[PDB]
Amino acid sequence: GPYMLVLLLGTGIFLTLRLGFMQIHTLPYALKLAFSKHETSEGDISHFQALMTALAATIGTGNIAGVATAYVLGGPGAIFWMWVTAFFGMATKYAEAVLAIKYRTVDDNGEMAGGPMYFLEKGLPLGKILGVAFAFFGAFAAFGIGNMVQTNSVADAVASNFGVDPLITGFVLAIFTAAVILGGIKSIGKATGIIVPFMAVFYILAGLVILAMNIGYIIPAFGTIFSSAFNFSAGFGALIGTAIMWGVKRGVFSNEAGLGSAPIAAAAAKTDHPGRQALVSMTGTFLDTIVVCTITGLVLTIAGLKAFPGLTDLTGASLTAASFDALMPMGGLIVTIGLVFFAYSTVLGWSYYGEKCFEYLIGTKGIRLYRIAFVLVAFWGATASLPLVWNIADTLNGAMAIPNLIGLLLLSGVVVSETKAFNEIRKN
Amino acid sequence: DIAMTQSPASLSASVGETVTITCRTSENIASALAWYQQKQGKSPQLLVMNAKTLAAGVPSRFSGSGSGTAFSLKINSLQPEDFGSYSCQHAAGWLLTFGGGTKLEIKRADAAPTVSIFPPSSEQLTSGGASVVCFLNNFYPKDINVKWKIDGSERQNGVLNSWTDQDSADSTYSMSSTLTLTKDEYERHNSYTCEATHKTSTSPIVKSFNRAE
Amino acid sequence: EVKLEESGGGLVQPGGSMKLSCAASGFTSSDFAMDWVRQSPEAGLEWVAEIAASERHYAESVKGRFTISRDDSKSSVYLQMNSLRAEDSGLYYCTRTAGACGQWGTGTTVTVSSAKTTPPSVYPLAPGSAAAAASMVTLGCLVKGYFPEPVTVTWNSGSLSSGVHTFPAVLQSDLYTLSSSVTVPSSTWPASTVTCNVAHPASSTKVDKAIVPG
């Protein structure tokens, strides 16, 4: 059950200790490197193009509506515990990307195939058993969080606000999905490179617009979050179920800390060493949770700090849009627009995430089948009725989660050694 | 399916005191428990949301607490306006279930019934039937026993009893016992009697009539 | 403020079908997810259906026999019931969902029975000849042999509203029986006439019975 979350975060504590809080110091340099200009040394696409691919998958309706679900059910304190998920999770994502170096490229052009299923093959053979299990899960798990959750949330949200959107929204999402992923990952890096920054800058500025117009409410909004999350007034650590569990569960969803579904994109980077790309990847969480999600969480609390009628019982995606429209003139239109790109981003990335784990099982023979399935399932997800889709998604992600976490624990020695190589290269 | 069991199933509270109501369920549900109050001819009214959080416009005497496997709804200094059924609901998933309910009633000083008995109408007889009606009005407590004697012999079956909800004004109950027979059976006997046994008196309240008048 | 008015309830034979409506106002039907909750005549309170603007979820008891729909343009929610059972009898309530059911509807009534609508027979209840002639007299109205519920009983066209008791109907084999009592000073009756006003909407019957002594 949810013991895996105690396991998942436990690695985050563990690796951060073993890696001595590496994330706080390396973060600026990795940020400089990730967005640095001008490198071509054995890779499918740029470091930047890999990050935008990973961020496209990492940024999803969980950033828009998954936080809202956590804010209502777990209280505003869930945001802080979402942060702890990312901060300690930074090390987890890094360890994922480092170990992705034990990757062998596939046939049908370079394409290259790196991921946790490969680590397990290069573990201490059981790893063959774990890797085939991981691919078995991840190949399925991609449809939930990567396809069905994101494709349904937009479809319903668009139908509420604009209402000329039965299957029509499903159709255009399928066409635009097929066009990009037709040309494989090389095509994906093109689209995710342009889409993601335009998406993120669009959303984040509006939040800073909201904060600018209501400056005074900022610090108390921080206060209620910090006052919550550490509110033991009720129950002996009974906020574990309230704020911590919802903060972690939803937080892991948005930033995808240790699900092992991150470095799959990191492998395609043109990297000299694992450490080069693994630092740019570790920035995936920071942009998702600390930047995007925190932007989303701040607006939600501010509306709660205000009075505002009728938002008291709003489900999730509608809550943030209503919370935005409350504070900003066209906030509702902004959020629903972002939701379209936010989900579309996650469809493409998670397609590659699911592909490569699928091909591990079947080879490149069925890659065409996976792509066409993903496009078809994307169409169905908008039309079909998936009320509790998040719940089954979290199970698949947890099913995906169990093996990779074991690997990161066992292969902690490899990465820490492999790190002591790259950081030595960083003095020259 | 999550089963939530409430206790006590029903209670009577002397006005101005404090009472505690319990909703207990099969499995742990964190803080996703909500409380309602329902009155006659009305929809449920939300009292407490998410175990302890307070709804706006609902008086401060209502307080709820607990998490996991023990929930309690606490009312301080009751008032007669709190008469109704109290139900609990959980938000675990999307198929939110409810409790069997708890009926809250009011305590008053004991009061004795006002018995009245009526013979069948002339119209009912020409229609082929005869119903004998006994009215027991404005009595407290609800626990009452009504015995029908036909010509001195008790009649066990054939009796329909109906009760009113507790009166809003004076907290008194009332009931009607209707004994239904055909005309031909009615005309077979001479004396019909209504015997009401209540805690207020050791000797029952007897009202009767004879058909030969 | 917020408005939720249910409609469409009625009497339907088992296996039959009908669809309910819940015209909503005072807010945005489109943004909020909506629920149907039903209360049995024994205060059951059972959940029935869920909907948001696209996808829906149903209770196992009714899966395949209920269809919940929505029309954000007409700001109304529907619930279509088919192949109905006796257990489907209850008050169907409209409401909006999230974690708690805060804003509720009026409620509409469904009765699923093979019984046939039948008008009531109204008989007056007047004391026996050898009454004790106490300070106050008690009179009554007996409404029996009617289906379906409900009946509305008033005394002297509402002039007598104090000292009246209308007892809940009791059902015995396909028909309902109900009695009501009024208490007036012995000075008034029979000096001032006392009348029973009974109405059964389903049968489109209205009758007045005057209580006359024997």
Side-chain angles (χ1 to χ4, degrees), chain B residues 23-168:
Chain B
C23 175
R24 198 44 256 140
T25 189
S26 51
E27 72 197 57
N28 191 324
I29 56 177
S31 84
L33 196 282
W35 289 96
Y36 306 78
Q37 155 175 282
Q38 188 183 188
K39 300 202 158 182
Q40 314 83 38
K42 267 202 264 290
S43 42
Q45 189 155 10
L46 183 74
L47 294 185
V48 163
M49 84 172 116
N50 279 314
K52 86 186 97 53
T53 320
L54 53 141
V58 165
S60 70
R61 333 188 307 262
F62 297 103
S63 98
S65 79
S67 188
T69 51
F71 292 110
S72 300
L73 170 59
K74 205 135 195 172
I75 307 167
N76 188 321
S77 167
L78 286 105
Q79 304 178 178
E81 227 60 62
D82 305 349
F83 157 57
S85 269
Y86 294 82
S87 303
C88 56
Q89 167 235 352
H90 74 62
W94 285 144
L95 152 73
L96 69 182
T97 67
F98 295 89
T102 286
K103 203 192 232 149
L104 194 299
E105 290 183 82
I106 301 303
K107 256 185 186 161
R108 87 177 295 286
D110 300 28
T114 310
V115 190
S116 324
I117 182 181
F118 304 81
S121 77
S122 59
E123 292 77 284
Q124 194 178 179
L125 300 183
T126 75
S127 172
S131 318
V132 185
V133 183
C134 202
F135 275 150
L136 303 78
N137 286 336
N138 302 340
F139 69 89
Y140 180 86
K142 193 185 179 169
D143 312 317
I144 198 172
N145 172 34
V146 179
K147 193 166 295 184
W148 283 86
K149 296 197 156 162
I150 284 182
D151 270 329
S153 198
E154 193 180 346
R155 182 171 182 86
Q156 299 283 347
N157 35 29
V159 190
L160 296 173
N161 294 340
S162 187
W163 275 268
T164 88
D165 282 324
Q166 209 182 8
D167 188 305
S168 35

Side-chain angles (χ1 to χ4, degrees), chain C residues 50-80:
Chain C
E50 192 259 2
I51 193 179
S54 175
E55 90 276 50
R56 61 198 213 205
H57 199 216
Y58 289 60
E60 295 87 3
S61 164
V62 308
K63 200 159 192 154
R65 332 184 302 106
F66 284 177
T67 303
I68 190 180
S69 56
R70 193 217 272 265
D71 184 324
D72 319 64
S73 324
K74 288 170 97 79
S75 282
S76 88
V77 84
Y78 300 83
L79 170 90
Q80 173 112 41

Side-chain angles (χ1 to χ4, degrees), chain C residues 1-211:
Chain C
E1 196 185 317
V2 190
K3 261 190 301 179
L4 292 156
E5 290 272 336
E6 293 88 350
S7 95
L11 168 77
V12 47
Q13 332 204 45
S17 42
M18 65 159 36
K19 97 187 296 183
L20 310 193
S21 320
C22 166
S25 306
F27 71 123
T28 84
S29 198
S30 47
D31 287 10
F32 299 84
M34 301 290 297
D35 270 344
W36 281 100
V37 179
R38 62 168 184 203
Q39 208 181 201
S40 47
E42 302 101 28
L45 259 193
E46 174 184 46
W47 183 76
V48 174
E50 192 259 2
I51 193 179
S54 175
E55 90 276 50
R56 61 198 213 205
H57 199 216
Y58 289 60
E60 295 87 3
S61 164
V62 308
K63 200 159 192 154
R65 332 184 302 106
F66 284 177
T67 303
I68 190 180
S69 56
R70 193 217 272 265
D71 184 324
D72 319 64
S73 324
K74 288 170 97 79
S75 282
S76 88
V77 84
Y78 300 83
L79 170 90
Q80 173 112 41
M81 315 185 296
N82 43 36
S83 277
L84 281 163
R85 284 172 192 172
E87 30 176 296
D88 302 311
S89 311
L91 241 184
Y92 285 83
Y93 282 106
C94 188
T95 193
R96 71 185 211 190
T97 171
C101 280
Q103 253 84 30
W104 287 71
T106 280
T108 198
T109 325
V110 178
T111 310
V112 181
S113 168
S114 311
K116 287 155 184 178
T117 317
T118 37
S121 295
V122 187
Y123 307 118
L125 304 179
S129 321
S135 75
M136 289 256 205
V137 79
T138 314
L139 311 182
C141 213
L142 174 73
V143 174
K144 99 165 308 198
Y146 76 78
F147 194 83
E149 197 100 77
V151 181
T152 74
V153 185
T154 64
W155 292 93
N156 268 351
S157 315
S159 307
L160 271 61
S161 47
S162 323
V164 315
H165 285 299
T166 310
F167 297 84
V170 60
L171 171 133
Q172 166 156 311
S173 279
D174 269 7
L175 286 159
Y176 284 100
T177 304
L178 171 140
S179 48
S180 160
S181 90
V182 71
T183 319
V184 300
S186 301
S187 324
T188 88
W189 189 77
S192 296
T193 76
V194 159
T195 323
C196 190
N197 305 131
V198 164
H200 190 213
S203 44
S204 305
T205 68
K206 307 186 79 288
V207 86
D208 300 355
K209 266 300 181 290
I211 318 300

Side-chain angles (χ1 to χ4, degrees), chain A residues 210-234:
Chain A
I210 278 174
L211 299 190
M213 292 190 301
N214 322 95
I215 288 292
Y217 285 100
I218 291 187
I219 168 74
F222 266 101
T224 166
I225 298 177
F226 274 106
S227 64
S228 175
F230 284 98
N231 179 326
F232 313 82
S233 71

